[PDB]
């Protein structure tokens, strides 16, 4: 029978023992494929991915006999793979991951005649990367993905990416990011844990360029609108103290409320960020406008108010334009 | 012929049936006719472009070694424990994003075997699958959410999925959704994939969803329209009452901002401009421009010449006030009609 | 020899095919099943579901399991031997997630009677969903159900029947937050027709009444107090401008913050709710009082003072009447 | 004598022991003594009326056919893998509302067998169990949260639980709770249930918890006292400073109402009136009445005689408000401290 | 000879190695040396008083009946499979509050057998263990957390644990904590417990976390100080602008007691007074006071032959202007000096 071929293949085959026990280390080629690259959770400094991990290697004990020929390969059922030997390919920086058996364990197994098997199990992982927050509205994040063994050493196991396309993403469509050309650098990354030895590693580095569109029309525009509103309030008769005063306190209160609302949602870090410095500058400008009005009122108690009023209404536009141009020159 | 002996004679140790080999090995690919029955839709949330569905998945196929000629009846239902002993397809969902079986009081799964060899296999599944959405017309959009069924352990030359010709996607009578209305028509087509390893058969189903305007209509529009009207009221106040005008403008702009902030804090942080956001931006621009024009009028009146330009600029100020007072409602009305005729069509 | 007796009942030497349904190809086997509610609650409209903790029971007869040798009639077994015989595969049509209990034992009770009756009981925790409408939110009444039906067989072979007397037993100490569970509970059938055959289905309907107290307390009472607050401000003469302006501004701020606190609790349902409309009318009345004072000042600033006083007093005598008629109409149309 | 043969002869294939039969079949019912060791309390939240506790549940019972008479030693410690082969009681928690074992590096379960046949079986469990609580005196309440243990697969005719006469509920010395204090005394009574089928043995333990009044005391009461005293200080000033007075009244009312709003959005929404709500409502009524009285005084103020009447009413309310607030405070505290 | 026969001879059906039997039964206690390697810290939360850690736990112990004398090599690496067939210590974490293994493509466990009989067994573990902290110095606090290791089904006379003399607790170089900094020194000691059923061996490890003030510093202090200086500027306006001034105050206090309510919104409800709370309260007291000063000066100015009280109001305004910033600076100095040490 056809199953008799795999029965003869598996007889006297102990999966607990790696191929070439006393021989050279086995080089296991690893291929990856992104299927649904989920968003990143800045609050948890992690991102969720769903991949079709693939492994191939050489197992001389699984060479096909002279009887069976086949077209290209004989694919056994997915449930058979519990009887084979596999590398302990785990993810070093994993926070939590799980298999998928919604209807059946999603594993594809191919066996070549010369004794090279391909095993592909679906994986769903939640990796973690150090989220840098400097220049937050235009940051360039780099999230890592490490693959390494745990139950062997560099003398028994080895991981090398395919010479072709190790990553073959079809479509990403991230809600607020985009990736075009990643790199497979930091290829070896060979871990060296004291007390056990050297473990093989391989790394993959992505590149995220955050879409500044949302924050451009979500936070920057209201702050600019409030600043312009304060400037227009500046164009009112100082004698109407009941009128000029509220339109500066409203500006500063709105700036403070916006800062508080938009600060508690981002992850907490102990260094300043571009959005925060922009908000601080806008708040300080509103505060300075209110203080200038106060000093104008003090000078009132004649043309003494007129000179300072015109000087400030001329200086504020140029000063804020200079600040805006230097900011967008230094952060873009 | 006792009922007990037949079950292990057709499938079991005495049967000599290898469950680890697909039907018709080294032959033509075996068809799988599969239809789904939605039982509880809902839980659609834009925060993760995903929704939770509960389905009864059914499959019908044929197997030459499953045919029997003993019982007069053709349909003989079988025990799920015996079901987990024969060949089954390895279909999965291309964008499951989290799923799990049901096991209350039993692993609920129905198996029926026909005399001619036809086999029907049905399970109950819950899918938190995801559909990439678009929010260009968010308060009035037409969404298309899909589910894809494809094999993973076989190639196109062994398995092929086909929908039932009549009554493909059955829907429960009591189905109802919040914030959405399920369209009657549902689309079906193929999604033949091409990975490194062979070609995998794939089918997909597409659901059209339309969003009820009501909640969004009232909350996102009525307060904004009312505060625009209130900002108009300020324009009817005489020039002298500067603090009243300033306070009313401040209140209106504060209400506009907050409302915009509250509206934006429900949707994914997408980059492209939505439909509601630009509308609220225009309303905020109206309010701010009204306040700015009042400030400009105040400056014009205050400026004065050195009967020392008499009431001439007071006249001019009243003229600009009246013309802007008659112009703003016309501009708002024409913009409103433009917006609601552009997005509705 | 209890061990050998149990084994010859079901096991290796028994020769009892567990996979075989009772009375194969014969008449259908009717099953009596009753539920015991032990812990209700955790009802949330924002997710349209509720959590229940029940002691599900099944009773029927197995002719090939009957014994006439052991002296006792009702013999209790263990779950380990329970997972060796045929049992119905009833599931919940709207389970929406559930799991067993595995604390120190799979808490399953099995009792085999001499004549053939079998009692089977399992602890179950169901987070099941019932669609709820908030059209009468401050006085809403809900109908939350629990469907039990078979999936592994057809109505031609399996039939479910609630116990004739005392079906839905309820623990005496059961309590709910902001809900009162009605005593009487409806029952009927739900025979469905799927693609392949028809399956037996049973139901048990629960009528739930939401407590009004908390809502009544925190929402309505401050609103009525500040409406009376506004009327007292209405009593004040127009000369004391700062006092009336303050009494109006404080009323407006308190009412708007109360409305904001009230609104942000419920799911984003399309149609208008019942609680908010009364809140909206109260906000309208507060704004109307403030605008009336503003218009009185506007007219006063412009022999018209007598007319201003006349309109002020007629509004003072009309607004309480309007509030009373609106409140009575609202309570009548909602309570009845 | 090798340990393997002894262990399999006591229980195993060679023993011929069936774990599916209770001790003393058709005989007297089996008493089971079970104490508890609280290891980590806390995470108690009123938003869903439950608390999570990590315990080392132990139970000792006599199995006559488990007795051995070979080793001179009396107490033998066992292995979990062979532990899961002998008869065990099926005790479960009637109000578990979710629970699970611990399997970290081992199924942490201890088995000890004595020569006479007494066996001790202990497992580490975590319970997210629910206790309904009343919030009549919420800032100063005392709660009685209970947990039950009862059989499910047997009858009172076969099983009966009983607490140890000495050292029933042992609590780790280092245990501490946030915003809560664990009373030392613990009630142990019986909860014998009468279900639809027979009687099931049941024993429950009741923990008395007290709420640390410090946090709520400060956060709620102190700002309210400060703002009402501020309202009084405003009351001291005469009627001429009308804008200052009305602004101060507005500030006080807004502060009181925002304190109440921020205080209320933490408790489970229950119909019956709490103890914080009445106090905050009284404070809000007091500040509102002060502002209303000032408005009325401003309204009553031409003829100098009306000015004298206004100052008389101002002084009488000035001497009245602090006395009324003090008597209310004394009444409230004395009634909610002895109740 | 062949690896299969040696593998089954060392343990398995032919060996007859009774896994459930502890090594050296009825003999001397078997000491175990165990060291852990932290791989990923972080996710420390104040609400639930716990933090999630990721560790590689290692245990080295000698099993005399496991010794082999066939292969020339002294150290041999096997797979997890045969690992799940031998005796293992039952160490469990005393305050884990839940945990789970890792099973991605394999239960990632490592077993290594030395020639003399020593065996090293290591597993990847994730622990959401609890740590009771105190918030007496919340914005400038130092927290000490513990992770005890102890047996569950044995006795001190049978099992004893000892930390490694060198390289006891290791940390990856790439380690970085959110909002925290980890101290280099890691104090370790014993935690020998006395339960009802005998005495159980116990060792423990302590970590010292220091909270970086930065995020809290800016997001709390800076807006409050800005609002306080806003109140100061409001206080620097002549009384003739009576409404606007007071209006500023109405906002000035209001937003403040909002921000205070915000600060405790992300912190657990604890009975004892925090450290940011007192600074929070002092700022609130200073602003309202400023408002009260404005009310008092308005009262004294509008009391009303028209020069003495006006001059007194101007003088009190001047003294309040020259005092309040100085008093605020004095308060800031003592607050920072007191809470620094
Ligand atoms: C990758 O890692 C090994 C580990 O020692 C190192 O010697 C070398 O750089 C690489 N080995 C290869 C590529 O075979
Ligand atoms: C369906 O099965 C038949 C016979 O096996 C054959 O046509 C083919 O393999 C399958 N596909 C189609 C499209 O017919
Ligand atoms: C079950 O009830 C049906 C009712 O139509 C009856 O025909 C049948 O005989 C009953 N069977 C048993 C075993 O009670
Ligand atoms: C067990 O409990 C019962 C309770 O009635 C008692 O009569 C009996 O003496 C106790 N001892 C045993 C183990 O039978
Ligand atoms: C382990 O170390 C302790 C302390 O030195 C010693 O008493 C014991 O005999 C040792 N056990 C073994 C098996 O080496
Ligand atoms: C069916 C969609 C309706 C959208 C709202 C239309 C409003 C028209 C009137 C605007 C004044
Ligand atoms: C449980 C401690 C109680 C301390 C005394 C509180 C007094 C509050 C009233 C002060 C007027
Ligand atoms: C952690 C260092 C802090 C240095 C002092 C900062 C003072 C900021 C406020 C100045 C008014
Ligand atoms: C490019 C970023 C430089 C940051 C310098 C330190 C903070 C300055 C705050 C004004
Ligand atoms: C005040 C102007 C500072 C400009 C800093 C420029 C830094 C460039 C790297
Ligand atoms: C650790 C960063 C401190 C930044 C302080 C900025 C102060 C601006 C006035
Ligand atoms: C929006 C009003 C602009 C007015 C410009 C000045 C016209 C003389
Ligand atoms: C915003 C006011 C602009 C005025 C320009 C000068 C008009 C003569
Ligand atoms: C005011 C009373 C209306 C009638 C109520 C009738 C209730 C059955
Ligand atoms: C409260 C500090 C400033 C002084 C108030 C007025 C003194 C009569
Ligand atoms: C007359 C006031 C002098 C300044 C006092 C400052 C107190 C800190
Ligand atoms: C936005 C208007 C700016 C005017 C500048 C005049 C010098
Ligand atoms: C207003 C200045 C904009 C500069 C943009 C540089 C890319
Ligand atoms: C469901 C639509 C309600 C419209 C209300 C308009 C006032
Ligand atoms: C595509 C850009 C549209 C801008 C609209 C601004 C009102
Ligand atoms: C030229 C003025 C036209 C006014 C039209 C009002 C409807
Ligand atoms: C079907 C909706 C038509 C709206 C027309 C608005 C002018
Ligand atoms: C049943 C409630 C009736 C209320 C009547 C209010 C006038
Ligand atoms: C169903 C809507 C009823 C409204 C009643 C208003 C008095
Ligand atoms: C126990 C100490 C209470 C002090 C209260 C001060 C208002
Ligand atoms: C580091 C950026 C500083 C910008 C100052 C205007
Ligand atoms: C879809 C295009 C909309 C443009 C609105 C100005
Ligand atoms: C463009 C508007 C069309 C309206 C038809 C009724
Ligand atoms: C307004 C009263 C209605 C009564 C209907 C029975
Ligand atoms: C205010 C009275 C408190 C009494 C406490 C025993
Ligand atoms: C305000 C007094 C309440 C008394 C409750 C017994
Ligand atoms: C600032 C104190 C009051 C002024 C007279 C001493
Ligand atoms: C310990 C708190 C001191 C506060 C000094 C203003
Ligand atoms: C240690 C910092 C002290 C700062 C005093 C202004």
Author numbering:
A (entry chain E): 33 to 333, 445 to 475
B (entry chain D): 8 to 313, 381 to 419
C (entry chain C): 9 to 310, 386 to 419
D (entry chain B): 8 to 308, 383 to 420
E (entry chain A): 8 to 311, 383 to 419
What does the paper say about this structure?
Here we report near-atomic resolution structures resolved in digitonin consistent with all principle functional states of the human α1β GlyR, which is a major Cys-loop receptor that mediates inhibitory neurotransmission in the central nervous system of adults. In all the structures determined, either with or without glycine, 4 α1 subunits and 1 β subunit were identified, consistent with the recent discovery of 4:1 α2:β stoichiometry of human α2β GlyR and heteromeric GlyR purified from porcine tissue. However, due to the distinct characteristics of the α and β subunit transmembrane domains (TMD), symmetric activation in ECD resulted in asymmetric structural rearrangements in the TMD, leading to asymmetric pore dilation that is distinct from homomeric GlyRs.
In the presence of glycine, two structures were resolved with widened pores sufficient for Cl− to pass through. In the other structure (gly-2), the orthosteric sites at all 3 α/α interfaces have clear glycine densities, while sites at α(+)/β(−) and β(+)/α(−) interfaces are empty. Nonetheless, the pore also dilated in an asymmetrical manner, but to a larger extent, resulting in a minimal radius of 3.8 Å (m cyan), which is too large for a physiologically open GlyR. In contrast, in the gly-2(expanded open) state, strong and connected densities are found in the widened α-α interface, with stronger and more inter-connected lipid-like densities in the pore. In the case that densities in the pore represent hydrophobic plugs, they would render the channel non-conductive in this glycine-bound state.
